[PDB]
Amino acid sequence: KDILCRLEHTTLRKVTANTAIYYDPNPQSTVVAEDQEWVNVYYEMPDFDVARISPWLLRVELDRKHMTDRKLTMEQIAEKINAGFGDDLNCIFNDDNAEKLVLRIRIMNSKMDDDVFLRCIESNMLTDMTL
């Protein structure tokens, strides 16, 4: 099975369970209640620039069974995102053993719509990452 998982193609569709774009008046505010403590833990001493984050947030809750079956982990997804798009796609992954595992994506600032831009980014991301 371990040999199988690294031979079978896996997009973001096969691992994700739900996807939603929220608007955050403050990353510390964290309108998603369940993620508040982890957000406070992460954004303290940030590796990226807090002032450069986009107000919008793309939160995707993955499928635990699919992740376990393919032996996938959060850091692999994060590094795949970083390789695919670069440093200006700051992504944060909650945890592995934590119940209801989830991960968040924001856009580093650097015309048509701010939210439709994230819509198109997700549309071209959900079936192109090749985990």
Partner 1 sequence: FVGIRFCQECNNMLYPKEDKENRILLYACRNCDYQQEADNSCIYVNKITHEVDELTQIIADVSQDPTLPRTEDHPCQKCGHKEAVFFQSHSARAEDAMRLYYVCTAPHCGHRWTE
d(CA 66, CA 86): 26
The enclosing H or E element of 67 equals: helix 64-69
d(CA 14, CA 61): 12
| Closer residue to partner 1 (CB): 24 or 35 | 24
Which positions from 48 through 87 interact with partner 1, judged by CB under 8 A? 55, 63
CB of 106 vs partner 1, minimal distance in Å = 14
Instruction: Convert residues 5-44 into a mask of x (bound to partner 1 by CB under 8 A) and - (unbound).
Output: --------x--xxxxxxxxxx-----x-------------
Half-sphere exposure of 17 toward its Cβ, with a 13 Å CA cutoff?
A: 11
CB of 56 vs partner 1, minimal distance in Å = 8
CB of 63 vs partner 1, minimal distance in Å = 8
List CB contacts of 1: < 8 A, sequence separation 6 or more: none
Residues that bind partner 1 (CB under 8 A): 13, 16-25, 31, 55, 63, 114-115, 122
